[PDB]
């Protein structure tokens, strides 16, 4: 071995794994196969709040 990394390979890998995930898939408001918009029946502003 003779050498331990300065920041730390394990911690850097864990942080990169966490930051590597693809962004969420916002879906509420788009139709399904039958044509029915998928989502919960709630006010458009109450949802954002």
């Amino acid at each position: 071995e003779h050498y331990k990394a300065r920041p730390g390979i394990a911690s850097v890998q864990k942080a990169t794994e966490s930051a590597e995930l693809p962004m969420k898939n916002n879906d509420e408001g788009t139709p399904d196969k039958r044509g029915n918009t998928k989502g919960a029946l709630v006010n458009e502003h109450v949802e954002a709040r």
């Binding site: 071995e1 003779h2 050498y3 331990k4 300065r6």
Partner: protein, 1127 residues
């Protein structure tokens, strides 16, 4: 337990209040305590409770727990708001303990053994039985003691105080093992907190480690030289010389180590050749000063084994101490001048015995420490209060003054008052003239605050004022103005005069008006709020704005203030001959006073009226009589009440107090007698009487430069910190003290002071408070001189250790290195409290000490003390300059190595390689590899390539040049590619290091040897943050003929650094095969060169290992054993 129980009870009583917050009020979230009988919202528990109480039909009140709680809260608010109670404590803090008494260093220590730091050690045993030469030849067979070890190889290593018999043990030693052992732990010590391997050290910190090593070396060799005692030589080896006898159990072994030129020379060996070359008459003692019959000689000069470096260090240390020296006659004169004749000390008059009393230091070394301890005190007010309290109790114990209100009582009791009245002037002041919490200390505390107006400002408490606006129509409220007017002139508050004008202005609002400056500092603003030069009303400097027709009383009071306020003076304490002068912004040997001083001329005092503190009371009483006179201010009063007020004022003006006489004549003498024996010297700024342009508005201290401006005079105004803190007092206490004073009826002044002042000049703590300042200045200078070696400072210093590798240091690195310096310099000199720590808060790369204050105009006065020398920094620089030439003795190699296979039968030592097989950047056909290097494999049988700096590709062969960091950053990818070619190929690399430790592996020259295992271990263990010590493979010298066997050698140095080799094949006639070196004649100059004078050292190139050293026998007695006093 009872501790917790009483603590809970005390909390349950004292914690009846929520808190003390500074914010504007608020109905909702303004801490409004709401009642319930009505919806009102009060802003205090006592306010809400007075609310609820006034609810309840006062005639029908009965006892209740609610009433009990009401009275308890009302009672405890006063005790909480008292100023002495606010600022006070019983247990000492670290900073106050540091200020009141600091751990005195131990700087006079003695040594008894022989001064030396370099020792000769055998590295390879000789062969005393052999085939060519019978054993009867050698002197070891006869058990003869030789000054130098018999061995095939003898090195010379470093071990500080290996032959020393010390008095006190400095705990900083530089101990080294011989070269054939690992020494990497000496250089992996300071900043290698990330290195894994126990046998590795980071190359980018060799410079810092070596600087710390040299500092510890110098700190260890700081002793004096004892005079032990000699003995005639009863044998014919010397010409009857006198020989030392150093103390110890096994002392008979030292007569052959101290004196190399005393053995016999029966043989033609190397040691005998040297001893026969030496001269004969330089042994033992040759000089002494015997100033007495039957007493030890004062000093001697002796020839003996010792190194010129440690001899020089101890000589310079003794020179510094000799500068610090003083004598009992000068101590007598100093103490007599300090006591001012009230104490007679005596010194003997006869041939002395050469004491050594190092207690005298310069003025810069004292002003620097004053600046430091003022920097350690800014803005705290719990660090400076205990000093004032101690001076207060000392003043009370030394003063012949008493206090008793019975004088005021008896004076008041003579005025006639009507029994059928509603106002009693004599009975009102008697009530409001009893101090709260019955403490009369505020008088002595204010009197002691005169010595400190640059860091402490004694103001009068806000509670002493008339409670939210006065009124001239109120008797109990008029006595408050009287008390404040009498009490203000004794405070240090620069804005004292504007109060006692705004107090009367507040009190008569609606009777007289005067033009203010703002809508905010109106005439109805509290008088205690005007504490700055900025807030003085314009009608106080331009009095014609006050008109004699509108505001006659204000006009008259303003004229009285401008024309009769007391005048400052001075007393001239101290004696700066022995003691330095510590004051910064005043001349040396002078003490300022906020009142005039005038020496008495009779030592049996009787009362008199002629002084400024009585004239002030007369003026105040006259104007009080005036503002009582007219019916314009007090219309509802009777002739009886007016005449009673007049009588009380006219008699209070003629009260017979000794306090003003005292403050004029005797108090400044007591201050001057107390000042020189004070653990924190006075720190004053000028007393401006009434001018708005000279009132000081700040006092700042700097400890570092700002951007690039290296001169302190240009950064002192923008890189300083303000110091100072107000301290509240009690006007009632001060005024009762001024009104009631008294002397004992048997007062004879000289007899009183002659035995009141004696017991404080019998202790000698003041003399020991100076060596602390010496060490403080030494530490500051040493830090400044060491940090410049690794950083870029603004100080001119020489740089010897530039060839050693070092990292690009930042503020954190500098702070760490300074911490190590501080710790080592405390461990040496044996003091446990703070030292050099106030400077470590910033960064120690641009340090500088300076101080200044500023007036109201903007005119700033600064004091920049001249940094005196420092023997410790000088000796560290000398040791570095000697390291530059004798680096091999500390196990350091200089240059760079050349990895490459060399198989032969020759016996050249790898530390002195033949110049034919060393190359450099100036060699034809050398490939220099820098930063942008890539390797490209070879395909289909073609050889792999590597990229030159110039963009070329070269096969794995030839003569190359690496920076060490290149390999160190690609250690594993390079091993795999290159190690197969270095071993049995044609590759030769010159790693560039600059400085590196090393080990040594010897081998029998007539057998096969191969250094590939050691070399491969080293290369394999190189790492981006560490390298193991460089292993060499050296042959063993041979006394006689031998046979040659092949040897394979891989690592070699570049320049000759086989300098720690002392002698090879000692005890034999000559060396036939291998590294040859006789005894170094240039080392022993005084013996081998008859023309050289005795005291002659060629220091920066050789340490000489033998010379003349002077041993002392001085006496270090306490001062009380030499300077006796006459009780």
């Amino acid at each position: 337990p009872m501790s917790t129980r009483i603590a809970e009870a005390t909390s349950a009583i004292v914690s009846k209040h929520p808190a003390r917050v500074g914010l504007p009020p608020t109905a909702s979230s303004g801490h409004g305590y709401q009642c319930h009988v009505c919806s009102a919202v009060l802003f205090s528990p006592l306010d809400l409770d007075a609310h609820v109480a006034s609810h309840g039909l006062h005639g029908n009140m009965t006892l209740t727990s609610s009433e009990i709680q009401r009275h308890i809260t009302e009672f405890i608010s006063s005790w909480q708001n008292h100023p002495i109670v606010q600022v006070s404590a019983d247990v000492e803090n670290r900073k106050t303990a540091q200020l009141l008494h600091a751990d005195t260093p131990r700087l006079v220590t003695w040594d008894a053994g022989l001064c030396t730091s370099f020792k000769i050690v055998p590295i390879v045993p000789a062969q005393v039985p052999q085939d060519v030469l019978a054993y009867t030849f050698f002197t070891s067979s006869y058990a003869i003691q030789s000054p130098f070890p018999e061995a095939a190889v003898s090195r010379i290593v470093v071990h500080t105080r290996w032959a020393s018999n010390v008095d006190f043990d400095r705990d900083s030693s530089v101990i080294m093992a011989p070269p054939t052992e690992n020494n990497i732990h000496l250089f992996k010590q300071l900043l290698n907190t990330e290195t894994l391997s126990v046998r590795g050290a980071n190359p980018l910190m060799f410079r810092a480690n070596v600087l710390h090593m040299l500092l510890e070396f110098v700190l260890d060799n700081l002793y004096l030289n004892r005079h032990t005692g000699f003995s005639q030589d009863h044998t014919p080896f010397t010409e009857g010389a006198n020989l030392r006898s150093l103390p110890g159990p096994d002392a008979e072994k030292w007569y052959s180590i101290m004196y190399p030129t005393r053995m016999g020379t029966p043989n033609v060996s190397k040691i005998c050749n040297f001893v026969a070359s030496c001269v004969r008459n330089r042994v033992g003692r040759f000089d002494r000063a015997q100033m007495m019959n039957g007493a030890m000689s004062e000093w001697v000069d002796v020839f003996e084994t010792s190194d010129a470096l440690t001899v020089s260090i101890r000589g310079r240390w003794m020179a510094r101490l000799a500068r610090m020296n003083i004598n009992p006659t000068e101590i007598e004169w100093a103490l007599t001048e300090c006591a001012q004749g009230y104490v007679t000390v005596t010194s003997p008059y006869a041939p002395s015995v050469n004491r050594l009393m190092p207690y005298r230091i310069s003025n810069a070394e004292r002003q620097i420490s004053q600046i430091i301890r003022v920097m350690n005190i800014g803005n705290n007010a719990t660090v400076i209060q205990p000093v004032l309290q101690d001076i207060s109790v000392l003043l009370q114990r030394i003063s012949p003054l008493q206090i008793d209100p019975t004088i005021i009582s008896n004076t008041m009791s003579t005025v006639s008052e009507s029994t059928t009245q509603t106002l009693s002037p004599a009975s009102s002041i008697l009530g409001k003239l009893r101090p709260s919490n019955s403490d009369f200390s505020s008088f002595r505390v204010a009197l002691a605050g005169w010595l400190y107006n640059g860091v402490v400002t004694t103001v009068i408490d806000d509670s002493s004022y008339p409670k939210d606006g006065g009124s001239v129509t109120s008797l109990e409220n008029l006595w408050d103005f009287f008390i404040l007017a009498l009490a203000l002139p004794l405070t240090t508050d620069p804005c004292a005069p504007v109060k006692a004008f705004m107090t009367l202005a507040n009190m008569m609002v609606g009777f007289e008006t005067i033009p203010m400056d703002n809508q905010i500092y109106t005439q109805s603003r509290r008088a205690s709020a005007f504490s700055t030069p900025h807030t003085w009303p314009r009608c106080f400097m331009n009095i014609q704005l006050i008109s004699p027709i509108d505001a006659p009383i204000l006009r008259q009071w303003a004229e009285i203030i401008h024309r009769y306020w007391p005048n400052p003076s001075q007393i001239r304490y101290g004696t700066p001959n022995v003691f330095g002068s510590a004051n910064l912004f005043t001349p040396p040997e002078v003490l300022l006073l906020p009142i005039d001083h005038q020496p008495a001329n009779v030592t049996t005092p009787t009362l008199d009226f002629t002084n400024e503190l009585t004239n002030w009371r007369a003026r105040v009483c006259e104007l009080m009589k005036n503002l009582v006179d007219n019916q314009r201010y007090q219309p509802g009063w009777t002739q009886s009440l007016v005449s009673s007020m007049r009588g009380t004022l006219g008699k209070l003006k003629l009260i017979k107090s000794m306090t003003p006489m005292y403050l004029q004549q005797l108090a400044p003498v007591e201050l001057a007698v107390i000042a020189p024996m004070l653990p924190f010297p006075p720190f004053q700024v000028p007393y401006v009487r009434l001018d708005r342009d000279r009132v000081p508005t700040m006092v700042g201290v700097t400890r570092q430069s700002r951007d690039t401006i290296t001169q302190p005079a240009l950064s002192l105004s923008t890189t300083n910190t303000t110091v100072g803190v107000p301290l509240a007092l009690d006007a009632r206490a001060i005024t009762v003290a001024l009104l009631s004073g008294k002397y004992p009826p048997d007062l004879v002044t000289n007899v009183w002071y002659a035995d009141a002042i004696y017991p404080m000049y019998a202790d000698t703590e003041v003399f020991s408070n100076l060596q602390r300042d010496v060490i403080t200045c030494e530490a500051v200078q040493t830090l400044v001189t060491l940090v410049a070696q690794i950083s870029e400072t603004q100080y001119p210093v020489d740089r010897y250790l530039d060839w050693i590798p070092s990292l690009r240091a930042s503020a954190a690195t500098a702070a760490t290195f300074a911490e190590w310096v501080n710790t080592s310099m405390k461990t040496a000199f044996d003091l446990s409290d703070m030292l050099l720590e106030p400077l470590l808060s910033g960064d120690p790369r641009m340090t500088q000490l300076a101080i200044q204050y500023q007036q109201y105009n903007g005119r700033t006065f600064n004091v920049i003390p001249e940094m005196p020398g420092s023997v410790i920094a000088d000796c560290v620089q000398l040791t570095a300059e000697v390291f530059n030439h004798e680096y091999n003795l500390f196990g350091i190699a200089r240059g760079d190595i050349i990895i490459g296979r060399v198989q032969s039968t020759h016996l050249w030592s790898p530390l002195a390689p033949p110049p034919d097989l060393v190359f450099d950047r100036d060699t034809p056909g050398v490939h220099i590899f820098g930063r942008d290097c890539r390797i490209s494999f070879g395909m289909n049988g073609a050889a792999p390539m590597i990229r030159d700096e110039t963009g070329m590709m070269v096969p794995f062969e030839g003569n190359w040049i690496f920076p060490l960091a290149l390999w160190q950053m690609n250690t594993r990818y390079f091993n795999q590619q290159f190690d197969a070619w270095i071993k049995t190929g044609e590759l030769r690399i010159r790693i560039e290091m600059g400085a590196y430790p090393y080990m040594l592996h010897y081998y029998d020259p007539r057998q096969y040897a191969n250094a590939w295992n050691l070399t491969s271990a080293w290369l394999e263990e190189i790492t981006p943050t560490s390298i193991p010590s460089v292993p060499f493979m050296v042959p063993i010298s041979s006394d006689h003929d031998i046979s040659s066997a092949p040897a394979v050698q891989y690592i070699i140095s570049t320049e000759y650094n086989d300098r720690s080799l002392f002698c090879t094949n000692s005890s034999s006639p000559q060396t036939i095969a291998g590294p040859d070196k006789h005894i170094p004649v240039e080392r022993y100059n005084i013996l081998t060169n008859p023309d050289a004078p005795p005291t002659q050292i060629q220091l920066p190139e050789v340490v000489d290992l033998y010379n003349v050293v002077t041993r002392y026998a001085y006496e270090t007695p306490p001062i009380t054993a030499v300077v006796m006093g006459v009780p």
